[PDB]
């Protein structure tokens, strides 16, 4: 599909250094729109994109009430998981949670999501049916039963199909000039000899939004999958992203190589070559 909303929660214990810290951020695609940190002076949910500022006091109070309760709730959960795993009170641990909804180009719900991890490894996840759970081990099963008893899955299904899609669509309209605008990448190829017999061709993509992009090198039209070095897509700081793909080629053979770029902001897919 084309759009999604996601909330990311991180709860971290720090024995001997105060109570566990809770941080929450909200994103619509690759655009962050809200934040909350329990370590702030006057913890409150703050705006992170201009289009959210127009929301009323009730919106901000409701978010803050929820996030302040989350801070308490997660302190209790970190205590609970420590016990489910028979761990010492001396170690630091982290519970992460990520949930939200995906919309297709038609605007209707493609699928819902809800997953949690403990120390960076899967713990419990709502299944695609939005009705059952997948617990990773006997400890997660304890959490599963509590949730089944509280009819959590039913409330999650209702949120994901109701409120989540409704707010997402509201945000996509209010922030349409940016959220619904794909900025194509500016591309170019550089050359750096690596020896008297080989050189590096690096294909650049700059200033694009959203982050989703495909950069590939071909030699005689054949994809150089195992021979292409790809860097992780990185943020520029102005909402856009950067990325590059490099291949080391024999000197005098650079014209046999073509870089192909696909991005949704592009009228049609690009093919580039080094221009001496």
């Amino acid at each position: 599909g084309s759009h999604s909303m996601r909330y990311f929660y991180t709860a971290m214990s720090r024995p001997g250094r105060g109570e566990p810290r809770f941080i929450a951020v909200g994103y619509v695609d690759d655009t962050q729109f809200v934040r909350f940190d329990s370590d702030a002076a006057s913890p409150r949910t703050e705006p992170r994109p201009p289009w959210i500022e127009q929301e009323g006091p009730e919106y901000w109070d409701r978010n803050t009430q929820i996030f302040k309760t989350n801070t308490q709730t997660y302190r209790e959960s970190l205590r609970n998981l420590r016990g489910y795993y028979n761990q010492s009170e001396a170690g630091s641990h982290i519970i992460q949670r990520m949930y939200g909804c995906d919309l297709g180009p038609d605007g209707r719900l493609l699928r819902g999501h809800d997953q949690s991890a403990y120390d960076g490894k899967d713990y419990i996840a709502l299944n695609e049916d939005l009705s059952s759970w997948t617990a990773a081990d006997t400890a997660a099963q304890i959490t599963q039963r509590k949730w089944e008893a509280a009819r959590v899955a039913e409330q999650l299904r209702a949120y994901l199909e109701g409120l989540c899609v409704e707010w997402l669509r509201r945000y996509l309209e209010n922030g349409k000039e940016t959220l619904q605008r794909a900025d194509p990448p500016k591309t170019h190829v550089t050359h750096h000899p690596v020896s008297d017999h080989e050189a590096t061709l690096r294909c650049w993509a700059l200033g694009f939004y959203p982050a989703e992009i495909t950069l590939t090198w071909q030699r005689d039209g054949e994809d150089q999958t195992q021979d292409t070095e790809l860097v992780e897509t990185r943020p520029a700081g102005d909402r856009t992203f950067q990325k590059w793909a490099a291949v080391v080629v024999p000197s005098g053979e650079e014209q046999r190589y073509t870089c192909h770029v696909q991005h949704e902001g592009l009228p049609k897919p690009l093919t580039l070559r080094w221009e001496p």
Partner: peptide
């Protein structure tokens, strides 16, 4: 708005 809080 975000999801309702819950304990693990």
């Amino acid at each position: 708005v975000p999801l309702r809080p819950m304990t693990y």
